[PDB]
Symmetry: C3
Subunit: 87 residues, 3 copies
Amino acid sequence: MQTAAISWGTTPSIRVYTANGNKITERCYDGSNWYTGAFNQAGDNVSATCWLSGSAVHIRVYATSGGSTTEWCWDGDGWTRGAYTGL
Amino acid sequence: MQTAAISWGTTPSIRVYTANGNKITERCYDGSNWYTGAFNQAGDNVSATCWLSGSAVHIRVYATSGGSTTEWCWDGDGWTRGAYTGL
Amino acid sequence: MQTAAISWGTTPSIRVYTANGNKITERCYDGSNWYTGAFNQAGDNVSATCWLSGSAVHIRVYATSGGSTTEWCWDGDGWTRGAYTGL
Ligand SMILES: C[C@@H]1O[C@@H](O[C@H]2[C@H](O[C@H]3[C@H](O)[C@@H](O)[C@H](O)O[C@@H]3CO)O[C@H](CO)[C@H](O)[C@@H]2O[C@H]2O[C@H](CO)[C@H](O)[C@H](O)[C@H]2O)[C@@H](O)[C@H](O)[C@@H]1O
Ligand SMILES: C[C@@H]1O[C@@H](O[C@H]2[C@H](O[C@H]3[C@H](O)[C@@H](O)[C@H](O)O[C@@H]3CO)O[C@H](CO)[C@H](O)[C@@H]2O[C@H]2O[C@H](CO)[C@H](O)[C@H](O)[C@H]2O)[C@@H](O)[C@H](O)[C@@H]1O
Ligand SMILES: C[C@@H]1O[C@@H](O[C@@H]2[C@@H](O)[C@@H](O)[C@@H](CO)O[C@H]2O)[C@@H](O)[C@H](O)[C@@H]1O
Ligand SMILES: C[C@@H]1O[C@@H](O)[C@@H](O)[C@H](O)[C@@H]1O
Ligand SMILES: C[C@@H]1O[C@@H](O)[C@@H](O)[C@H](O)[C@@H]1O
Ligand SMILES: C[C@@H]1O[C@@H](O)[C@@H](O)[C@H](O)[C@@H]1O
């Protein structure tokens, strides 16, 4: 079991990603309760980074499964698969 | 032996958390010597994130101890337990 | 196989560090394609953080191998060992 954490704004919002048994899930905080995010993909290791473009949040999640890393992107309209490739 | 690293401010300040043999400890840099920080909690895995608000720094450290993630909060007066819960 | 991710600026730039087979390598995005960065150092675990001084990027990569963490710095003039020491 392995986690990644990011945050933004002043509230703040927090996202914590968890790799456990080859699935990555997301728990979210935006100032009230912790809830379950829409992020649900394969991998046994995860890292993440985020940035604001004005008020809009952008997140990149790096999900590693079987020796390969997939980038997942949030840009205000669901999780999309990104262009990242490895060595 | 696993690390998480965070930073803030113009200096910057840096914090590096290490999980080594089920304990998580902290080394700190504020613009001069590294020193050992107040953080000491149980875990084999650590992730962390931080933000500023009105010139004060807030840190959330996520400590995992087998099947369970525990949030630790720094808000300027000691490490307190946070509301984070997993899936 | 384990990763760390950082990002900066408006484009933004992203750097993803991957620890595998006791070597850490780096994949980079600056607004066009992904490329292989200059960073190449030993370690089985990796964490990273960064900040901008104006427009100038500073990166700190914490590479852990042999039960020991070495801080690697990017400050505009290649990758150098930093003053970080552990417990
Ligand atoms: C970043 C994103 O957050 C969640 O997505 C929901 C989104 O959260 C807002 C949040 O309310 C703000 O306070 C925060 O500053 O920004 C985030 C991102 O905009 O809020 C929108 C509504 O405005 C929507 O509820 C998003 O829901 C998504 O997840 C749902 C269930 O959790 C549904 O699956 C829906 O289809 C999704 O689009 C997280 O859910 C998400 O995974 C990201 O972490
Ligand atoms: C941070 C640094 O980035 C890469 O190094 C190159 C550096 O990248 C710029 C980038 O072009 C900008 O868009 C970005 O905003 O900032 C970074 C850092 O200034 O740019 C310089 C030229 O200004 C140079 O090309 C750096 O290349 C170095 O790595 C190369 C391999 O990809 C070659 O080895 C070259 O000889 C090196 O100077 C990363 O490669 C690097 O590891 C750092 O991550
Ligand atoms: C944010 C915290 O940093 C360190 O605490 C510092 C204290 O040790 C002391 O030096 C005061 C006085 O300026 O600064 C504090 O920031 C850590 O010890 C602590 O765990 C937090 O990381
Ligand atoms: C910032 C960029 O966003 C999307 O375009 C991804 O396809 C890229 O890999 C990068 O993450
Ligand atoms: C930003 C919030 O700070 C405290 O209230 C914690 O208990 C929450 O879980 C969250 O970390
Ligand atoms: C910001 C600082 O940069 C250099 O002076 C390093 O040697 C320190 O360890 C620290 O990372």
